[model samples]
Target: MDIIFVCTGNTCRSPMAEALFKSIAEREGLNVNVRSAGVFASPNGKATPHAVEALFEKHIALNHVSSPLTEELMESADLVLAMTHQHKQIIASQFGRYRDKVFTLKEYVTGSHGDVLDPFGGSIDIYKQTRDELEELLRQLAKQLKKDRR
Candidate 1:
């Protein structure tokens, strides 16, 4: 399945989510294609500095352009994972037809739920916190979404 990660801006949370999911999914052999976007994307800009630092520790280097959460992309996604219920609601409100496949990341991946932390303007320390949570949660997610290799 194809998975899309969403957040307020492409600079912080969603990129980290994408990197962590992509990195772990590949290393662990999960069969999901992943990408990320933002509700109000920055347009061709790179991820935030703290985000760059945080992900570098995990050996991930993100060379991503901030893109808007367009209808076409959402419609194509097998699963669209938002950082929060608010993001999901926004997409549902705007694209009613595509609503059914969207969910909050923590909700889908962990099944126990709430919005993810948004570390914009926060320190590398705060970014570190968000990254850690996403990494741990996505390890569970990769297993859950793993293909039936047997």
Candidate 2:
């Protein structure tokens, strides 16, 4: 299965979630391909420097080049997980054909949750906090993910 994480810029929150999910998912032997993109993020930009460092500290590496969400990416993903409801709405509105596959990251993982705040243009510490949240959410996601895999 495939899961794509979405945020406005694709540099901060969603990429963090993607990397964190990849790290934990791999270690747990969860089976899913993870990708991340932005709703308004420019094409082919590298992840924010501190966002890379933040993940590196945990020994997770991301060679993520930020890209704006595209119809093709959505078409390929089994799930499109957004950071906020607004991003989800944009996907739903823009791609009516794949509307049911889109959802907020936390809401999909926890079944009922609020938006994960975007921590853009922040200190490394703040980015870590967002990464920490992603880890927690993905840990929950991992359990549900495993249930589906086997």
Candidate 3:
């Protein structure tokens, strides 16, 4: 299965979630393809420095290039996880044909419709909080996927 993480910008939340999910998938030996993109991204953008620092602190390596979310990407993904409700809406409206496959991260994991607080331009503490939250949700998602695969 292919999973795509989406945010307004690929600099922080989505990229972090991508890395976190990748780690969890690796440890579980799941053959899922995971990637991330942004609803609005410059063609030549990189992840934020704070995000890189946070991942580094956790000893996680992040090698990502910013890419704008596209219909093709969404079409290829089995699941598209968004960082916020607005993002979910945008993806759904823009790619309505695949609307059933898109959802916010927290909404998908907890089944409680809501947004993952954006840590962009926020303090390191906020970024940490966001990372921790995404990790927990990714853990649940990985477990669920493993169960479904069996």
Q: lDDT winner among the candidates?
A: 2
Candidate 1 residue 58 C-alpha distance from true site, Å:
1.6
Counted clashes in each candidate structure:
0, 0, 0
Better of 2 and 3 by lDDT: 2
Q: Which lDDT tens digits does candidate 2 get at residues 1-150?
A: 888999998988888889899888888989889899998999868889889999999998877889998888989989899999999999888889999999898788888968988778888899889888889999989878888853
True lDDT of residue 139, candidate 2? 91
TM-score of 1: 0.93
Each model's lDDT:
0.86, 0.88, 0.87
**Tens digits of lDDT, candidate 1, 91-122:** 78877898888999889877777999778999
Whole-model lDDT, model 2: 0.88
Q: Which portions of model 1 show Cα errors greater than 4 Å?
A: 147-150
* Model 3 misplacement above 4 A: none
CA displacement after TM-score superposition, residue 86 of candidate 2 (Å): 0.8
Error of 2 at 124 (Å): 1.2
How many clashing residue pairs, candidate 2? 0
Each prediction's TM-score against the native?
Answer: 0.93, 0.95, 0.95
